[PDB]
Amino acid sequence: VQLQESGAEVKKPGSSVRVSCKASGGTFDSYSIHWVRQAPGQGLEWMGGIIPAFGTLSSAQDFQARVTISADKSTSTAYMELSGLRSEDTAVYYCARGSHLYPNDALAIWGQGTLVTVSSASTKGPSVFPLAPSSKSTAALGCLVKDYFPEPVTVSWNSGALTSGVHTFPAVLQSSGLYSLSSVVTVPSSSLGTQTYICNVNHKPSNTKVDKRVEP
Amino acid sequence: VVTQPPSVSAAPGQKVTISCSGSNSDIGNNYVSWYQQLPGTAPKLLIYDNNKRPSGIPDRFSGSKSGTSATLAITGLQAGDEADYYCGTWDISLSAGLFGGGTKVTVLGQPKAAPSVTLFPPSSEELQANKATLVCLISDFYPGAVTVAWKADSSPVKAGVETTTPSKQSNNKYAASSYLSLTPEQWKSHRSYSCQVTHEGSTVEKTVAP
Numbered sequence A: 001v002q003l004q005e006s007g008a009e010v011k012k013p014g015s016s017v018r019v020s021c022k023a024s025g026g027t028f029d030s031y032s033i034h035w036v037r038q039a040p041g042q043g044l045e046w047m048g049g050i051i052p053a054f055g056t057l058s059s060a061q062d063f064q065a066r067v068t069i070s071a072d073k074s075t076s077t078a079y080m081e082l083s084g085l086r087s088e089d090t091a092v093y094y095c096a097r098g099s100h101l102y103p104n105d106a107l108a109i110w111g112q113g114t115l116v117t118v119s120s121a122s123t124k125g126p127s128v129f130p131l132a133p134s135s136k137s138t139a140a141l142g143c144l145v146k147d148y149f150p151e152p153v154t155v156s157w158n159s160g161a162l163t164s165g166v167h168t169f170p171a172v173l174q175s176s177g178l179y180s181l182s183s184v185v186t187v188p189s190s191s192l193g194t195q196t197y198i199c200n201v202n203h204k205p206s207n208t209k210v211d212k213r214v215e216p
Numbered sequence B: 001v002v003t004q005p006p007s008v009s010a011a012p013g014q015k016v017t018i019s020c021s022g023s024n025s026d027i028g029n030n031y032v033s034w035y036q037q038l039p040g041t042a043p044k045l046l047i048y049d050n051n052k053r054p055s056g057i058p059d060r061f062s063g064s065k066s067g068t069s070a071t072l073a074i075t076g077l078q079a080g081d082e083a084d085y086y087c088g089t090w091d092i093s094l095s096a097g098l099f100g101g102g103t104k105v106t107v108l109g110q111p112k113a114a115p116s117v118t119l120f121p122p123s124s125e126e127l128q129a130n131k132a133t134l135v136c137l138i139s140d141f142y143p144g145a146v147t148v149a150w151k152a153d154s155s156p157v158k159a160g161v162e163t164t165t166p167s168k169q170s171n172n173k174y175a176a177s178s179y180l181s182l183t184p185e186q187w188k189s190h191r192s193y194s195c196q197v198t199h200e201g202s203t204v205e206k207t208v209a210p
C-alpha cells in the first residue's frame, strides 16, 4: 500500500525527464495511477493517468504534445515522461494510486514526490560535517550538509533506527547559488556514551550518499 | 476552473468549512475528493466519493456535495490541522483531473512560546577543509516568526549570514536555523560569536567561544 519515488534530478531547458513510481505490493491490480505536479509554493496540477490493467490512459490537454504515460507490469512501475522542459517545469512530480477497482475514483495512495529542477547550472554533491554534541548543546547533535545543487537532500539517522527527536531543516539558498541544510536530533545525554550516531545523507541528483559519524 | 478561497481561519476547537465551486462539466456531473497537504509533505486523501473517509482519517473531517459545489468541514480544529486543502474532481468530457486552487487553514490564538537557542561552533573537519560555519538552531517557539542577528565579539556581522523561514516541529511549535560563514581572518581573530533571536519583541541570545 505504498508508492515509491526518488529524490531526484537536474535538467537543462529543452531536455526530458522520466519520473518513476513503483507499487510496493507488486501490483497495480485494477486501480488507476495518476501523475500530479506542484511547482514550489504553488497548487496541485494533474498531468496524466493510466489504468495499467487495461492500458487506458489520458493526459492533460496543456501537456498532450509534451507528456507520455506508461506502465511496466514486470516491476509494477508507472512512468511519466515530460519533454521540452521549461523553467516553469521545476516542480515536485507526485504519483498517486487510485481508490476505485475498474466512476467515483480518487487519489488514495501518494508517493513522496520527485523534485525535477530545470536549470543550466551544473550538479554539485554536498560536503557533510558533524555538529558534535557537548556540554554546550537531553543533548542536541546533528549534521551540516553544505553547498550542494540542485535540491533536495534527505537525511536519516542510524539507517532509520532513530526517528524520535529528529528535525531536518529546509535548505538555505546561498549567494553562490548552492544550497545548505542541517539535520538535528535531541537524544538522552546518557545515550552519548552507549551508542553511535550516523547521519545518512542522500543527494539523489548527484547519485551521492554520505554516512557521516557524529561523535561527542 | 474549480475555485476555493485562498484561506480560512478559526481558533482551536472551532468548526471550519471549505467550499469548492466548479461547473456542470466537472463537480456538477462527477464526484469530489479532498486532499490535505501538511507543510513539507505529500498530499493525503481526506474524503472521496463526496463524503467517504478512508480508514485512519479523523471523523472531524466530513464532506458534502450540492450541484456544482462541494464542502469539506473540519470540526474541533487542532494546530495539527494547519495545512493546505485541495478539492479534486474528474471531468469525463475532457477525461482530465482537476484541482481547486487550495485553501490554507490557519489556527489562530495558539499559545505563545519563547525560543530556545542552540549554537554549534565549526567542526574540526570543516576547519581542516579551510572553512568555518557556525550553526544556530532556534526551536520550540510560537508564533512562527523570528529575526536572527549575529555578532563576532561585539561587532555586528551581516555578510555570510543565511537564515531559514521557520517551519513546524512534530510538537507543532516552530524551529528555524541560521548560518554564519567566516573568513580565516575572522576565525583567527574573534574570541566569541553570538546568535541573537528576536521573537515578539523580546530577544534570546546564545554565545559560543571556540
Ligand SMILES: CCCSc1nc(N[C@@H]2C[C@H]2c2ccc(F)c(F)c2)c2nnn([C@@H]3C[C@H](OCCO)[C@@H](O)[C@H]3O)c2n1
Binding pocket: A032, A033, A034, A046, A049, A050, A051, A056, A057, A058, A098, A103, A105, A106, A107, B033, B087, B088, B089, B090, B091, B092, B095, B096, B097, B098, B099
Ligand atoms: C483513461 C484515463 C484513466 S485514469 C481515470 N481516472 C479517473 N478518476 C481519477 C482518479 C480521479 C481523480 C480525482 C480527483 C483528482 F483531482 C484527480 F486528479 C483524479 C477516471 N474517472 N473516470 N475515468 C474514465 C474511465 C474511462 O476509461 C476508459 C476505459 O475504457 C475514461 O472515459 C475516463 O474518463 C477515469 N479514468
